[PDB]
Amino acid sequence: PQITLWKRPLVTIKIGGQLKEALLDTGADDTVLEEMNLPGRWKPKMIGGIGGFIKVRQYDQILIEICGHKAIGTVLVGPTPVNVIGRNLLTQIGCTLNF
Amino acid sequence: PQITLWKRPLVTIKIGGQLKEALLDTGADDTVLEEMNLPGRWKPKMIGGIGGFIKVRQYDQILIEICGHKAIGTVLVGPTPVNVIGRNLLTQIGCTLNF
Ligand SMILES: CCC(CC)CN(C[C@@H](O)[C@H](Cc1ccccc1)NC(=O)O[C@H]1CO[C@H]2OCC[C@H]21)S(=O)(=O)c1ccc(OC)cc1
């Protein structure tokens, strides 16, 4: 689809078999989701944003469907203000910026 | 143009008579720029992201050119680690997300 930006580009995602709403975020290198349960192993990591750094759990090679498009990649879980889909997954679904 | 997301979507902007690099950021409601001593009145504001909130100065009706596309709107100035062009201006230059 072509998504205009008068509203937040929020979309439905499927991860761990569960539906969620997430923000398509071209300013995020990484995908960061709010606290949730995911199966498999994870590693503790740090990630920094506009206000400083937070502790996240890093899940690698996670299946996630974004607005009907499949991706498999790294998902960070932690106290982010909102679920964000970052460039690591936006590239996989073929998302580009156009003006 | 079309911008892929293999790397950060950095572009040159002109604001306050200065050229700077800034992210085209679909996840930013507002535009947030590195500390700069703009003239005119402003209003205090706090904006939150990963890590928490930062204090910024809100300037209204600021002229800003993004890849040769002119815009005018609100710009927030403060200790951000990166310049981000938010949806308030991305809509003015006709920017969409496409996949
Ligand atoms: C609330 C959603 C999101 C935070 C997630 C908001 N951000 C825009 C993002 O694009 C920032 C913009 C941003 C980019 C880089 C450094 C600071 C901020 N990116 C970001 O935090 O990404 C992190 C996750 O992936 C990593 O790659 C970048 C940092 C990591 S922001 O910078 O904090 C922000 C911008 C405008 C605003 O107006 C009300 C309020 C908050």
Side-chain angles (χ1 to χ4, degrees), chain B residues 12-42 44-62 64:
Chain B
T12 306
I13 64 168
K14 178 161 66 155
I15 176 178
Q18 292 191 311
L19 298 193
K20 302 174 175 295
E21 299 297 285
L23 290 176
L24 304 177
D25 188 353
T26 59
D29 295 340
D30 299 335
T31 297
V32 193
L33 298 185
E34 58 178 294
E35 179 57 47
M36 60 186 309
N37 204 4
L38 285 176
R41 296 187 63 193
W42 52 276
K45 192 183 172 86
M46 278 171 77
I47 57 169
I50 285 174
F53 288 73
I54 59 164
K55 306 179 169 64
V56 300
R57 301 190 310 279
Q58 171 178 338
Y59 294 83
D60 296 323
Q61 291 300 116
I62 298 298
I64 185 160

Short mmCIF file of all heavy atoms in Angstrom, two decimals, chain B residues 12-64, unseen atoms left out:
data_model
loop_
_atom_site.label_atom_id
_atom_site.label_comp_id
_atom_site.label_asym_id
_atom_site.label_seq_id
_atom_site.Cartn_x
_atom_site.Cartn_y
_atom_site.Cartn_z
N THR B 12 19.72 16.38 3.34
CA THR B 12 20.14 17.73 3.70
C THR B 12 18.91 18.62 3.85
O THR B 12 17.99 18.58 3.03
CB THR B 12 21.07 18.33 2.64
OG1 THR B 12 22.17 17.45 2.42
CG2 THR B 12 21.60 19.69 3.10
N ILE B 13 18.91 19.42 4.92
CA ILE B 13 17.86 20.40 5.15
C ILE B 13 18.50 21.77 5.28
O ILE B 13 19.68 21.90 5.63
CB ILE B 13 17.02 20.08 6.41
CG1 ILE B 13 17.89 20.16 7.68
CG2 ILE B 13 16.38 18.71 6.29
CD1 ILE B 13 17.12 20.16 8.96
N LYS B 14 17.71 22.80 5.00
CA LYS B 14 18.10 24.18 5.24
C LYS B 14 17.10 24.81 6.20
O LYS B 14 15.90 24.83 5.92
CB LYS B 14 18.18 24.97 3.94
CG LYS B 14 18.54 26.44 4.15
CD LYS B 14 19.07 27.10 2.89
CE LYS B 14 18.00 27.20 1.81
NZ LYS B 14 18.31 28.32 0.86
N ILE B 15 17.60 25.31 7.33
CA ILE B 15 16.77 25.98 8.32
C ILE B 15 17.61 27.04 9.02
O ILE B 15 18.78 26.82 9.33
CB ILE B 15 16.18 24.99 9.35
CG1 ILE B 15 15.40 25.76 10.43
CG2 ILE B 15 17.30 24.14 9.96
CD1 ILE B 15 14.75 24.90 11.47
N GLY B 16 16.99 28.19 9.30
CA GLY B 16 17.69 29.28 9.96
C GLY B 16 18.95 29.71 9.25
O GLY B 16 19.89 30.19 9.90
N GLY B 17 19.00 29.56 7.93
CA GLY B 17 20.20 29.89 7.18
C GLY B 17 21.33 28.91 7.33
O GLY B 17 22.48 29.25 7.01
N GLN B 18 21.06 27.70 7.80
CA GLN B 18 22.08 26.68 7.98
C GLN B 18 21.68 25.40 7.26
O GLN B 18 20.49 25.08 7.15
CB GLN B 18 22.32 26.36 9.47
CG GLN B 18 22.94 27.50 10.26
CD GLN B 18 23.39 27.06 11.64
OE1 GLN B 18 22.64 26.42 12.38
NE2 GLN B 18 24.63 27.38 11.99
N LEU B 19 22.68 24.69 6.75
CA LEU B 19 22.48 23.37 6.17
C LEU B 19 22.82 22.30 7.19
O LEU B 19 23.86 22.37 7.85
CB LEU B 19 23.33 23.18 4.91
CG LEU B 19 23.07 24.11 3.72
CD1 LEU B 19 23.78 23.56 2.49
CD2 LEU B 19 21.59 24.28 3.44
N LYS B 20 21.95 21.30 7.31
CA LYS B 20 22.12 20.22 8.27
C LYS B 20 21.61 18.93 7.66
O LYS B 20 20.90 18.92 6.65
CB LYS B 20 21.36 20.51 9.58
CG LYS B 20 21.78 21.80 10.26
CD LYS B 20 20.90 22.10 11.45
CE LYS B 20 21.39 23.32 12.21
NZ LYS B 20 22.73 23.10 12.82
N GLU B 21 22.01 17.81 8.27
CA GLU B 21 21.51 16.49 7.90
C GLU B 21 20.45 16.07 8.91
O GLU B 21 20.62 16.25 10.12
CB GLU B 21 22.64 15.46 7.86
CG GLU B 21 23.76 15.75 6.85
CD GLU B 21 23.27 15.76 5.41
OE1 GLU B 21 23.01 14.67 4.85
OE2 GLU B 21 23.14 16.86 4.84
N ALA B 22 19.36 15.50 8.40
CA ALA B 22 18.24 15.11 9.26
C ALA B 22 17.60 13.85 8.70
O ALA B 22 17.62 13.61 7.49
CB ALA B 22 17.19 16.22 9.37
N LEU B 23 17.01 13.07 9.60
CA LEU B 23 16.30 11.85 9.25
C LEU B 23 14.88 12.16 8.79
O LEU B 23 14.16 12.92 9.46
CB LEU B 23 16.22 10.91 10.45
CG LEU B 23 17.47 10.21 10.95
CD1 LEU B 23 17.13 9.43 12.21
CD2 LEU B 23 18.02 9.28 9.90
N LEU B 24 14.46 11.56 7.68
CA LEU B 24 13.04 11.51 7.34
C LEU B 24 12.40 10.43 8.20
O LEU B 24 12.59 9.24 7.95
CB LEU B 24 12.85 11.21 5.85
CG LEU B 24 13.54 12.16 4.87
CD1 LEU B 24 13.32 11.69 3.44
CD2 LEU B 24 13.03 13.59 5.04
N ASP B 25 11.65 10.85 9.23
CA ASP B 25 11.26 9.95 10.31
C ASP B 25 9.74 9.85 10.42
O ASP B 25 9.09 10.71 11.02
CB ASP B 25 11.87 10.42 11.63
CG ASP B 25 11.67 9.43 12.75
OD1 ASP B 25 10.94 8.44 12.52
OD2 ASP B 25 12.25 9.62 13.84
N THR B 26 9.18 8.76 9.88
CA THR B 26 7.74 8.53 9.95
C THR B 26 7.25 8.24 11.36
O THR B 26 6.05 8.33 11.61
CB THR B 26 7.34 7.38 9.02
OG1 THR B 26 8.03 6.18 9.41
CG2 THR B 26 7.69 7.71 7.58
N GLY B 27 8.15 7.90 12.28
CA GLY B 27 7.79 7.66 13.66
C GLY B 27 7.76 8.89 14.55
O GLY B 27 7.40 8.79 15.72
N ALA B 28 8.15 10.05 14.02
CA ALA B 28 8.17 11.30 14.78
C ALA B 28 6.95 12.13 14.44
O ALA B 28 6.76 12.52 13.28
CB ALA B 28 9.45 12.08 14.49
N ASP B 29 6.10 12.40 15.44
CA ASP B 29 4.98 13.31 15.24
C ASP B 29 5.47 14.69 14.84
O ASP B 29 4.95 15.32 13.92
CB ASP B 29 4.13 13.42 16.50
CG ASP B 29 3.46 12.13 16.88
OD1 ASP B 29 3.31 11.24 16.02
OD2 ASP B 29 3.07 12.02 18.06
N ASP B 30 6.49 15.17 15.55
CA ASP B 30 7.01 16.52 15.40
C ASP B 30 8.45 16.45 14.90
O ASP B 30 9.09 15.40 14.91
CB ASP B 30 6.95 17.28 16.73
CG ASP B 30 5.52 17.43 17.25
OD1 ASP B 30 4.58 17.41 16.44
OD2 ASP B 30 5.35 17.58 18.48
N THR B 31 8.94 17.60 14.46
CA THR B 31 10.31 17.75 13.99
C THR B 31 11.18 18.22 15.15
O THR B 31 10.83 19.18 15.85
CB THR B 31 10.35 18.74 12.83
OG1 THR B 31 9.60 18.22 11.73
CG2 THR B 31 11.77 19.02 12.37
N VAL B 32 12.31 17.54 15.36
CA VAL B 32 13.20 17.82 16.48
C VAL B 32 14.60 18.04 15.93
O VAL B 32 15.16 17.14 15.28
CB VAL B 32 13.21 16.68 17.52
CG1 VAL B 32 13.88 17.14 18.80
CG2 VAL B 32 11.80 16.19 17.79
N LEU B 33 15.18 19.20 16.20
CA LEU B 33 16.49 19.54 15.66
C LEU B 33 17.49 19.79 16.78
O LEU B 33 17.13 20.25 17.87
CB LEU B 33 16.42 20.78 14.76
CG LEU B 33 15.57 20.68 13.49
CD1 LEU B 33 15.75 21.95 12.70
CD2 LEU B 33 15.91 19.47 12.64
N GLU B 34 18.75 19.48 16.49
CA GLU B 34 19.88 19.74 17.37
C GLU B 34 19.88 21.19 17.86
O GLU B 34 19.34 22.08 17.19
CB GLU B 34 21.19 19.45 16.65
CG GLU B 34 21.38 20.27 15.37
CD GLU B 34 22.71 20.01 14.68
OE1 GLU B 34 23.76 20.36 15.26
OE2 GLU B 34 22.70 19.46 13.56
N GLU B 35 20.50 21.43 19.01
CA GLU B 35 20.56 22.77 19.56
C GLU B 35 21.04 23.76 18.52
O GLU B 35 22.07 23.57 17.88
CB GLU B 35 21.49 22.79 20.78
CG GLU B 35 21.64 24.15 21.42
CD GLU B 35 20.32 24.73 21.85
OE1 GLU B 35 19.52 24.01 22.49
OE2 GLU B 35 20.07 25.92 21.54
N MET B 36 20.26 24.83 18.33
CA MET B 36 20.64 25.92 17.45
C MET B 36 19.97 27.19 17.96
O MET B 36 18.85 27.15 18.49
CB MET B 36 20.25 25.65 16.00
CG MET B 36 18.76 25.44 15.77
SD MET B 36 18.37 24.96 14.06
CE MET B 36 19.22 26.23 13.12
N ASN B 37 20.67 28.32 17.80
CA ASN B 37 20.24 29.58 18.41
C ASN B 37 19.37 30.37 17.44
O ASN B 37 19.75 31.41 16.91
CB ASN B 37 21.46 30.38 18.86
CG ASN B 37 21.13 31.36 19.96
OD1 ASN B 37 20.01 31.41 20.46
ND2 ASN B 37 22.12 32.15 20.36
N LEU B 38 18.16 29.85 17.23
CA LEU B 38 17.20 30.50 16.35
C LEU B 38 16.68 31.79 16.98
O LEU B 38 16.52 31.87 18.20
CB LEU B 38 16.02 29.59 16.05
CG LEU B 38 16.21 28.43 15.07
CD1 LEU B 38 14.92 27.61 15.02
CD2 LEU B 38 16.59 28.92 13.68
N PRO B 39 16.38 32.80 16.18
CA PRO B 39 15.74 34.01 16.71
C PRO B 39 14.25 33.82 16.89
O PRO B 39 13.64 32.90 16.35
CB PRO B 39 16.04 35.07 15.64
CG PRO B 39 16.09 34.28 14.37
CD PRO B 39 16.61 32.91 14.72
N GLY B 40 13.66 34.71 17.67
CA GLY B 40 12.22 34.75 17.85
C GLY B 40 11.78 34.06 19.13
O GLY B 40 12.56 33.45 19.86
N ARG B 41 10.48 34.18 19.39
CA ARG B 41 9.88 33.62 20.58
C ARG B 41 9.72 32.11 20.45
O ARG B 41 9.72 31.55 19.35
CB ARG B 41 8.52 34.26 20.85
CG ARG B 41 8.57 35.76 21.14
CD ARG B 41 7.21 36.28 21.58
NE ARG B 41 6.76 35.66 22.82
CZ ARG B 41 5.53 35.73 23.30
NH1 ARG B 41 4.58 36.39 22.64
NH2 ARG B 41 5.22 35.12 24.44
N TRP B 42 9.57 31.46 21.60
CA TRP B 42 9.41 30.01 21.64
C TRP B 42 8.62 29.65 22.89
O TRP B 42 8.44 30.47 23.79
CB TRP B 42 10.77 29.31 21.63
CG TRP B 42 11.71 29.81 22.67
CD1 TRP B 42 12.52 30.90 22.59
CD2 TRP B 42 11.93 29.24 23.97
NE1 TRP B 42 13.24 31.04 23.75
CE2 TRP B 42 12.89 30.04 24.62
CE3 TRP B 42 11.40 28.13 24.64
CZ2 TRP B 42 13.34 29.76 25.90
CZ3 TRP B 42 11.85 27.86 25.93
CH2 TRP B 42 12.81 28.67 26.54
N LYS B 43 8.14 28.41 22.92
CA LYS B 43 7.42 27.87 24.06
C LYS B 43 8.09 26.59 24.54
O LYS B 43 8.51 25.77 23.72
CB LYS B 43 5.96 27.57 23.69
N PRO B 44 8.22 26.38 25.85
CA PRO B 44 8.82 25.13 26.34
C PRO B 44 7.93 23.93 26.03
O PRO B 44 6.71 24.03 26.01
CB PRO B 44 8.93 25.35 27.86
CG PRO B 44 8.77 26.81 28.06
CD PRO B 44 7.89 27.29 26.96
N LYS B 45 8.58 22.79 25.81
CA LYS B 45 7.88 21.54 25.55
C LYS B 45 8.77 20.38 26.00
O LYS B 45 9.99 20.51 26.08
CB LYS B 45 7.52 21.40 24.07
CG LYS B 45 6.54 20.27 23.74
CD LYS B 45 6.31 20.18 22.24
CE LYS B 45 5.50 18.96 21.86
NZ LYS B 45 4.03 19.21 21.94
N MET B 46 8.13 19.25 26.30
CA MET B 46 8.83 18.02 26.61
C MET B 46 8.30 16.92 25.70
O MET B 46 7.08 16.79 25.53
CB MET B 46 8.67 17.64 28.09
CG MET B 46 9.65 18.38 29.01
SD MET B 46 9.37 18.17 30.78
CE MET B 46 10.04 16.52 31.05
N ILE B 47 9.21 16.15 25.11
CA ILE B 47 8.86 15.08 24.19
C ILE B 47 9.55 13.81 24.65
O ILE B 47 10.68 13.85 25.15
CB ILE B 47 9.24 15.42 22.73
CG1 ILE B 47 10.74 15.73 22.62
CG2 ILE B 47 8.40 16.60 22.25
CD1 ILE B 47 11.24 15.80 21.20
N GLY B 48 8.87 12.68 24.48
CA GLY B 48 9.32 11.42 25.04
C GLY B 48 9.59 10.39 23.95
O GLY B 48 8.85 10.31 22.97
N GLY B 49 10.65 9.61 24.14
CA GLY B 49 10.95 8.49 23.29
C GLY B 49 11.62 7.39 24.08
O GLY B 49 11.46 7.31 25.30
N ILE B 50 12.37 6.52 23.40
CA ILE B 50 13.14 5.51 24.12
C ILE B 50 14.14 6.22 25.02
O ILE B 50 14.89 7.10 24.58
CB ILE B 50 13.81 4.55 23.13
CG1 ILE B 50 12.76 3.59 22.55
CG2 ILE B 50 14.95 3.77 23.79
CD1 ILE B 50 13.27 2.68 21.45
N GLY B 51 14.12 5.86 26.30
CA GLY B 51 14.99 6.45 27.29
C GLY B 51 14.32 7.49 28.17
O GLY B 51 14.81 7.76 29.27
N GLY B 52 13.21 8.07 27.71
CA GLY B 52 12.52 9.07 28.50
C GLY B 52 12.29 10.36 27.74
O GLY B 52 12.21 10.35 26.50
N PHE B 53 12.19 11.47 28.46
CA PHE B 53 11.85 12.75 27.87
C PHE B 53 13.05 13.68 27.85
O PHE B 53 13.98 13.54 28.66
CB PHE B 53 10.70 13.41 28.65
CG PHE B 53 9.38 12.76 28.43
CD1 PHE B 53 9.10 11.53 28.98
CD2 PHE B 53 8.41 13.38 27.66
CE1 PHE B 53 7.88 10.92 28.78
CE2 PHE B 53 7.19 12.78 27.45
CZ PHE B 53 6.92 11.55 28.02
N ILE B 54 13.03 14.62 26.91
CA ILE B 54 13.98 15.72 26.86
C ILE B 54 13.20 17.03 26.78
O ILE B 54 12.07 17.07 26.28
CB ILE B 54 14.97 15.61 25.67
CG1 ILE B 54 14.23 15.59 24.33
CG2 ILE B 54 15.84 14.38 25.82
CD1 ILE B 54 15.14 15.87 23.13
N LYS B 55 13.81 18.09 27.28
CA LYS B 55 13.25 19.43 27.17
C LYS B 55 13.66 20.05 25.84
O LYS B 55 14.82 19.95 25.43
CB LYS B 55 13.73 20.32 28.32
CG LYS B 55 13.48 19.76 29.72
CD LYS B 55 14.03 20.71 30.78
CE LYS B 55 13.58 20.35 32.19
NZ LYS B 55 14.10 19.03 32.63
N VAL B 56 12.70 20.69 25.16
CA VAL B 56 12.95 21.32 23.87
C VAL B 56 12.28 22.69 23.84
O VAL B 56 11.43 23.01 24.67
CB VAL B 56 12.44 20.46 22.69
CG1 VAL B 56 13.15 19.10 22.68
CG2 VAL B 56 10.93 20.28 22.76
N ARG B 57 12.68 23.49 22.86
CA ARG B 57 12.08 24.79 22.62
C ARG B 57 11.27 24.72 21.33
O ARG B 57 11.80 24.35 20.28
CB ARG B 57 13.15 25.88 22.53
CG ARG B 57 14.00 26.01 23.79
CD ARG B 57 14.89 27.25 23.76
NE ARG B 57 15.66 27.39 22.53
CZ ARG B 57 16.80 26.75 22.28
NH1 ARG B 57 17.31 25.92 23.17
NH2 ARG B 57 17.43 26.95 21.13
N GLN B 58 9.98 25.05 21.43
CA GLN B 58 9.08 24.98 20.29
C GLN B 58 9.06 26.32 19.56
O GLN B 58 8.67 27.34 20.14
CB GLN B 58 7.67 24.59 20.74
CG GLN B 58 6.63 24.72 19.63
CD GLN B 58 5.25 24.28 20.07
OE1 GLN B 58 5.09 23.52 21.02
NE2 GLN B 58 4.24 24.76 19.36
N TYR B 59 9.46 26.30 18.30
CA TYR B 59 9.38 27.46 17.41
C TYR B 59 8.31 27.19 16.36
O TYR B 59 8.29 26.10 15.77
CB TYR B 59 10.72 27.74 16.73
CG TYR B 59 11.83 28.16 17.67
CD1 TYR B 59 12.56 27.22 18.37
CD2 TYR B 59 12.14 29.50 17.85
CE1 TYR B 59 13.57 27.60 19.23
CE2 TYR B 59 13.15 29.89 18.70
CZ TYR B 59 13.87 28.93 19.39
OH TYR B 59 14.88 29.31 20.24
N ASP B 60 7.44 28.17 16.12
CA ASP B 60 6.34 28.01 15.18
C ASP B 60 6.60 28.78 13.89
O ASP B 60 7.33 29.77 13.87
CB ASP B 60 5.02 28.49 15.82
CG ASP B 60 4.62 27.65 17.02
OD1 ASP B 60 4.84 26.42 17.01
OD2 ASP B 60 4.08 28.22 18.00
N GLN B 61 6.01 28.28 12.80
CA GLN B 61 6.06 28.94 11.49
C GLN B 61 7.50 29.16 11.02
O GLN B 61 7.86 30.22 10.51
CB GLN B 61 5.29 30.26 11.53
CG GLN B 61 3.79 30.07 11.67
CD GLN B 61 3.20 29.27 10.52
OE1 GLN B 61 2.69 28.17 10.72
NE2 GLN B 61 3.29 29.82 9.31
N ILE B 62 8.32 28.13 11.17
CA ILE B 62 9.72 28.18 10.73
C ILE B 62 9.80 27.65 9.31
O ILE B 62 9.24 26.60 8.98
CB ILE B 62 10.62 27.36 11.67
CG1 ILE B 62 10.58 27.93 13.10
CG2 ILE B 62 12.05 27.31 11.14
CD1 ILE B 62 11.09 29.36 13.24
N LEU B 63 10.52 28.38 8.45
CA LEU B 63 10.77 27.93 7.09
C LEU B 63 11.89 26.89 7.08
O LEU B 63 12.94 27.08 7.70
CB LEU B 63 11.15 29.12 6.20
N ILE B 64 11.65 25.80 6.37
CA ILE B 64 12.62 24.71 6.30
C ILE B 64 12.53 24.08 4.92
O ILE B 64 11.43 23.83 4.42
CB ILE B 64 12.38 23.67 7.41
CG1 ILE B 64 13.47 22.59 7.39
CG2 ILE B 64 11.01 23.04 7.26
CD1 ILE B 64 13.58 21.84 8.71
#
